[PDB]
Amino acid sequence: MNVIMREIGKKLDELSREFYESVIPPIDMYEEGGELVVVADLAGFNKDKISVRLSAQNELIINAEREIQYIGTKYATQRPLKIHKVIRLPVKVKRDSQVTAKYENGVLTIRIPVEGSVSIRIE
Amino acid sequence: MNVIMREIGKKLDELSREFYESVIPPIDMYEEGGELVVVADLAGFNKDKISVRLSAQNELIINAEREIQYIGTKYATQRPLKIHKVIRLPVKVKRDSQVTAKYENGVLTIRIPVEGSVSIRIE
Amino acid sequence: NVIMREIGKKLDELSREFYESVIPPIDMYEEGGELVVVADLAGFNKDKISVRLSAQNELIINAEREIQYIGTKYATQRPLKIHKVIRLPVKVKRDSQVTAKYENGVLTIRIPVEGSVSIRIE
Amino acid sequence: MNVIMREIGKKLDELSREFYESVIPPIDMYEEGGELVVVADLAGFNKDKISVRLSAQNELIINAEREIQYIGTKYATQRPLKIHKVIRLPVKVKRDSQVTAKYENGVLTIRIPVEGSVSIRIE
Ligand SMILES: [Ca+2]
Ligand SMILES: [Ca+2]
Ligand SMILES: [Ca+2]
Ligand SMILES: [Ca+2]
């Protein structure tokens, strides 16, 4: 039945959007100059609608939201409305140090200041 | 094992990037006013390095290329370097009409004029 | 060690994926003008296995399963879902209903085949 | 040279069977309630021809053998004839404790008691 066929298309497309919502965004992590920088491909979002935060845990969290409204017949709606990404941080980040987030060309770049030395424990 | 672990980690990172290369970009497709619109999330790319193609078989093809060079330690390399996506268009493209592609905020917007007909039963 | 922990989890999944691609091994032979396909497909629900014949003459076996365990897991190799496409050496008989039987982790499929090929005359 | 092609095919079939023998069977290992459990997919084997052994070195060994012969033309013979798999257990096996092996639906399940301890900090 066509009605049956149509429903499947809707479900697949919705599954697709969700899959992207979990996967996006891919990130690159590297440490440079005592600086930890995270780069994320995050196309089509407002700067206001993006939030970057650090938990006390050294976890790095990225949240973004958008509304997409299209007028016309719709064949696919893959793009993710809602983004939540939680990122493990390899090393402890200096407390009370400036953190820079810049949003360019759909790319979110985060620089975290890096502390070189680790106090180690005896016994 | 230490060397092996590093090689393996490097291998694992390569796979993750490859997975992204396969799934990016997500696209939205909708048609209004005899126009088909494709919207794709393609962050962190250069317009000069992006190619958009229309095919005789009615596919739309998007190719993206970029160079990633990183200085210092690398913890993650998820972000895609090479993009190849082939989309089978729902509607036949108009044979002789202008086709437009734009790149803003990491988003590639493609507009294609469309050829179509629907038949009305005569009573 | 957490990342080392991270590496291990991925390797295990990669392993699971590898099994999903390879499983199952196939034995193919022709008996009595029938094509018999035997696949080793352990621990799957019979209700959960689908066998179908392609227009192109490919033979397809589909199976999926859920595996859930309680406690620490050291390995999860076993395949959750298998999609296998088999190209068929001989043209399949039209009509000619085909039967599938599943026992002891083994799925056996019997297919009738046309015994002759007509030849075009130029 | 079609017959030589056939010999080559027979060799290739032979290799495939060999590769499978190396990779079969895939195993699931989990430890719960002092029992370590191994689940392996070993379809189409006689119970009598399957051997399960526990090693001094703490390995678990699975051995199986089968006879496969067919009548008429053979197009493929992937399925393994003889199986040897050595698994090194994550945790110590409890000495002289009952171990159970069950084979059903082509699945071999092995239950092994383990010796382990954890230390609780005092005060
Ligand atoms: Ca319905
Ligand atoms: Ca609103
Ligand atoms: Ca051999
Ligand atoms: Ca051998």
Give the CATH number of the domain where residue B95 resides. Answer: 2.60.40.790
Option in B28, B42, B78 nearest A68 (CB): B28
Nearest ligand by distance to the CA of D10: 3
Residues linked to residue B100 through DSSP beta bridges, in sequence order? B111
- What H or E segment, with its residue span, contains residue B108? strand B107-113
Q: Closest ligand to A6 CA?
A: 1
Residue B47 to residue C77: CA distance in whole angstroms:
44
Residues 6+ apart with CB under 8 A from B79: A26, A27, A28, A39, A40, A41, B17, B20, B44, B68
Q: Which residues of B touch A21 (CB under 8 A)?
A: none
Question: Which of A25, A76, A80 is nearest residue B29 as measured by Cβ atoms?
Answer: A76
Helices A2-23/B2-23 angle, 10° precision: 140
From chain D, pick out residues whose CB is under 8 angstroms from the CB of C106: 43-44, 106
In chain A, what residues touch B76 (CB-CB under 8 Å)? 27-30
Known binding-site positions of B:
7, 14, 18, 67
Which residue reads 């650090």 in tokens? A54
Instruction: State which H helix or E strand residue D12 sits in.
Output: helix D2-23
Sign of CA dihedral C75, C78, C80, C85: positive
- The verdict on whether residue D104 carries a ligand-binding annotation is no
Q: Do C42 and D43 touch (CB under 8 A)?
A: yes
CB atoms < 10 A from the CB of B73, how many?
11
Q: CB distance C27–D68 less than 8 Å?
A: yes
β-sheet bridge partners, residue B82: B65
For residues A1-11, one letter each, b for 16 or more C-beta atoms within 10 angstroms of the residue's C-beta and e for the rest, the string is eeeeeeeeeee
Q: Which residue is listed with tokens 């085949």?
A: C113
Question: For residue D14, how far is its CA from the centre of ligand 3 (angstroms)?
Answer: 6
Task: Record the tokens describing residue A35, joined without a space.
Answer: 């600086």
Q: For residue A4, how far is its CA from the centre of ligand 1 (angstroms)?
A: 6
Residues 6+ apart with CB under 8 A from B103: B42, B45, B47, B50, B109
What's the domain range around D47? Answer: 1-123
SS3 B120: coil
Tokens 């493609």 -> residue: B110
- Which one-letter amino acid corresponds to residue C71? G
Ligand nearest to the CA of A49: 2
Look at D27 and C78 and tell me if their CB atoms are within 8 Å: yes
Contact A78 B28 (CB under 8 A): yes
Which residue among C4, C10, C14 places its CB closest to the CB of B5?
C4
Phi and psi of C32, rounded to 5°?
55, 40
Q: Cβ of A107 and B43 within 8 Å?
A: yes
Beta strands in chain C (DSSP E): 26-31, 34-40, 49-53, 59-64, 72-76, 81-86, 99-103, 106-112
Q: Which residue of C has its CA nearest to D40?
A: C78
Ligand 1 centroid–CA A8 distance in Å is 9
Assess whether the previous peptide bond of B80 is cis (omega < 30° from 0).
no
Closest-lying ligand to the alpha carbon of A81?
A: 2
Q: How far is A120 from chain B (nearest CA, A)?
A: 22
Q: How many CB atoms lie within 10 A of CB C27?
A: 22
Residue B88 contacts residue B54 (beta carbons within 8 Å): no
Whether the CB-CB separation of D107 and C45 falls below 8 Å is answered with no
Nearest chain B Cα to A31, which residue?
B73
Breaks (C-N over 2.5 A) in chain B follow: none
Enumerate the residues of chain B whose CB falls inside 8 A of the CB of residue A79: 26-28, 39, 41
User: Are B88 and B59 a contacting pair, CB within 8 Å?
Assistant: yes
Compute the residue count for chain D. 123
Which one of D31, D72, D78 has the shortest CB-CB distance to C27? Answer: D78
Are the CB atoms for A35 and A110 separated by under 8 Å? no
Contacts for C30 with CB less than 8 Å, ≥ 6 apart: C36, C90, C113, D72, D73, D75
Residues of B in contact with C11 (CB under 8 A): 8, 12
Report residue D9: phi and psi, to 5°.
-65, -40
Strands C106-112 and D27-32: unpaired
Whether residue D24 and residue C31 make contact (CB cut-off 8 A), yes or no, is no
Answer whether C26 sits within 8 Å of D76, measured CB to CB. yes
CB pairs under 8 A between B and C: 10
User: Which distant-in-sequence residues (6+ apart) come within 8 Å of C40 by Cβ?
Assistant: C23, C24, C25, C105, C106, D24, D41, D43, D44, D79, D80, D106
Count of structural domains within chain C: 1
Nearest one of C86, C90, C47 to C66, comparing CA atoms: C47
Which DSSP helix (H) or strand (E) runs through A21? helix A2-23
Neighbours of B22 (CB within 10 A): 11
What is the whole-number distance in angstroms between the Cα of residue D2 and the centre of ligand 1?
A: 54
Q: How far apart are CA B30 and CA B26, in angstroms?
A: 14
CB-based contacts of D99: which residues, under 8 Å, 6+ apart?
A: D54, D93, D110, D111, D112, D113
Distance (Å) from the C-alpha of residue B75 to the closest C-alpha of chain A? 5
Instruction: Compute the distance from residue C16 Cα to the ligand 3 centre, in Å.
Output: 26
Distance (Å, rounded) from C-alpha B31 to C-alpha B114? 9
Q: Over the Cα atoms of chain A, what is R_g? A: 19
Question: Which among C94, C83, C98 is positioned nearest to C35, based on CA atoms?
Answer: C98
> Which tokens in the block code for residue A119?
């106090």
The coordinates were experimentally obtained by X-ray
Reported resolution, Å: 2.4
Q: Is D18 annotated as a binding residue?
A: yes
